[PDB]
């Protein structure tokens, strides 16, 4: 699942 | 479009109209910094001597040393845990049977706390609630009580059952978010009548992705310190341009932008009473 970014 | 004016006056009115039924909440780190839980973006992370700052957050760089993060949360530890208006004005919005879901970007359970329950919550970057031992064999779960004792002991947390690593059940960057978080996002926003954007920045993906998942004449209240959400000038919300119809922005404290529509809407005594009640409960206990 994609994935957390920023 | 179906806000008669583009104020928070507009927005309350159509709240008390027929046509809006369901409420979806986006909400950050802003609104708990006033229970006492910074964010990240308002103006403390050197004695753990990281290569970059970030790293503490970020899954590659826990994995291989779990300590810094820990250390972190013990000196982030609250000593109690009251949520803040913002976060009784969710549950207002639950008791009258206008909250469809609240995604959270925050881990610190307070929705919890306010009375949220499990299913109208998507914690999208996990939550303390609960942690788990790493290792795929085992997965044995345990509490909070169980997680702040070993965070204060100074003591890394390891399984009881295996020895392995005992982690919050967090989201780092890094990791996939969780399914429910997808499935939510799949089906909440076919039918949404407002978003209630609040103490966010918009800038962790795929969670900021949210506002546009909308359908385009679903109004969107922003409430924070700071216009968020417009698209980039280099690299959204429309508040200011001849197109705005939709986008309201309130700047100022979540929660005294809850405090000004809840008076719109005929609820500042209620919220006050629930506030005050809640708050004075949690003392006593
Ligand atoms: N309480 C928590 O669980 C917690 C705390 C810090 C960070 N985090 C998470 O870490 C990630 C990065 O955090 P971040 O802080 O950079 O991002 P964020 O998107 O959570 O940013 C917080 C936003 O809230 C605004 N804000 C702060 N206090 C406010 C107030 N009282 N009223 C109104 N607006 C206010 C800030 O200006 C900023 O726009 C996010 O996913 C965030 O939710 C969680
Ligand atoms: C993604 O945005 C989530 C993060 C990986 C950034 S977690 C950010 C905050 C971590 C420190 C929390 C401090 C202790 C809080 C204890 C809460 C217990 C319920
Ligand atoms: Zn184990």
Same mark, same amino acid.
Request: glycine share 6%; with cysteine; hydrophobic share 35%.
């Given at each position: #699942?994609?994935?957390?970014?920023? | 479009? #179906?806000?008669?004016?583009?104020?928070?006056?507009?927005?309350?009115?159509?709240?008390?109209? @027929?046509?809006?039924?369901?409420?979806?909440?986006? !909400?950050?780190?802003?609104?708990?910094?006033?229970?006492?839980?910074?964010?990240?973006?308002?103006?403390?992370? @050197?004695?753990?001597?990281?290569?970059?700052?970030?790293?503490?957050?970020?899954?590659? %760089?826990?994995?291989?040393?779990? @300590?810094?993060? =820990?250390? #972190?949360? &013990?000196?982030?530890?609250?000593?109690?845990?009251?949520?803040?208006?913002?976060?009784?004005?969710?549950?207002?919005?639950?008791?009258?049977? +206008?909250?469809?879901?609240?995604?959270?970007?925050?881990?610190?359970?307070?929705?919890?706390?306010?009375? +949220?329950?499990?299913?109208?919550?998507?914690?999208?970057?996990?939550?303390?609630?609960?942690?788990?031992?790493?290792?795929? *064999?085992?997965?044995?779960?345990?509490?909070?009580?169980?997680? &702040?004792?070993?965070?204060? *002991?100074? !003591?890394?947390?390891?399984?009881?059952?295996?020895?392995?690593?005992?982690?919050?059940?967090?989201?780092?960057?890094?990791?996939?978010?969780?399914?429910? =978080?997808?499935?939510?996002?799949?089906?909440? =926003?076919?039918?949404?009548?407002?978003?209630?954007?609040?103490?966010?920045?918009?800038?962790?993906?795929?969670?900021?992705?949210?506002?546009?998942?909308?359908?385009?004449?679903?109004?969107?209240?922003?409430?924070?310190?700071?216009?968020?959400?417009? *698209?980039?000038?280099?690299?959204?919300?429309?508040?200011?341009?001849?197109?705005? %119809?939709?986008?309201?922005?309130? +700047?100022? @404290?979540?929660?005294?932008?809850?405090?000004?529509?809840?008076?719109?809407?005929?609820?500042? &005594?209620?919220?006050?009473?629930?506030?005050?009640?809640?708050?004075?409960?949690?003392?006593?206990?």
């Amino acid at each position: #699942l994609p994935k957390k970014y920023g | 479009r #179906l806000l008669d004016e583009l104020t928070l006056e507009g927005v309350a009115r159509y709240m008390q109209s @027929e046509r809006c039924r369901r409420v979806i909440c986006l !909400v950050g780190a802003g609104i708990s910094t006033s229970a006492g839980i910074p964010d990240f973006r308002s103006p403390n992370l @050197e004695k753990y001597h990281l290569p970059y700052p970030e790293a503490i957050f970020e899954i590659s %760089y826990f994995k291989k040393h779990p @300590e810094p993060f =820990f250390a #972190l949360a &013990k000196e982030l530890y609250p000593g109690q845990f009251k949520p803040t208006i913002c976060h009784y004005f969710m549950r207002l919005l639950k008791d009258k049977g +206008l909250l469809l879901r609240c995604y959270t970007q925050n881990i610190d359970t307070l929705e919890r706390i306010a009375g +949220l329950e499990q299913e109208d919550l998507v914690e999208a970057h996990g939550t303390f609630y609960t942690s788990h031992c790493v290792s795929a *064999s085992c997965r044995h779960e345990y509490p909070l009580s169980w997680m &702040k004792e070993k965070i204060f *002991s100074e !003591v890394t947390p390891k399984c009881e059952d295996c020895q392995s690593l005992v982690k919050p059940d967090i989201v780092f960057f890094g990791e996939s978010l969780p399914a429910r =978080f997808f499935s939510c996002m799949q089906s909440d =926003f076919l039918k949404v009548d407002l978003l209630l954007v609040m103490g966010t920045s918009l800038q962790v993906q795929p969670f900021a992705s949210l506002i546009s998942k909308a359908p385009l004449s679903t109004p969107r209240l922003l409430i924070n310190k700071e216009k968020a959400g417009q *698209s980039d000038p280099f690299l959204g919300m429309d508040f200011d341009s001849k197109k705005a %119809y939709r986008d309201v922005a309130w +700047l100022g @404290e979540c929660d005294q932008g809850c405090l000004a529509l809840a008076e719109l809407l005929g609820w500042k &005594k209620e919220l006050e009473d629930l506030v005050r009640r809640e708050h004075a409960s949690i003392d006593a206990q």
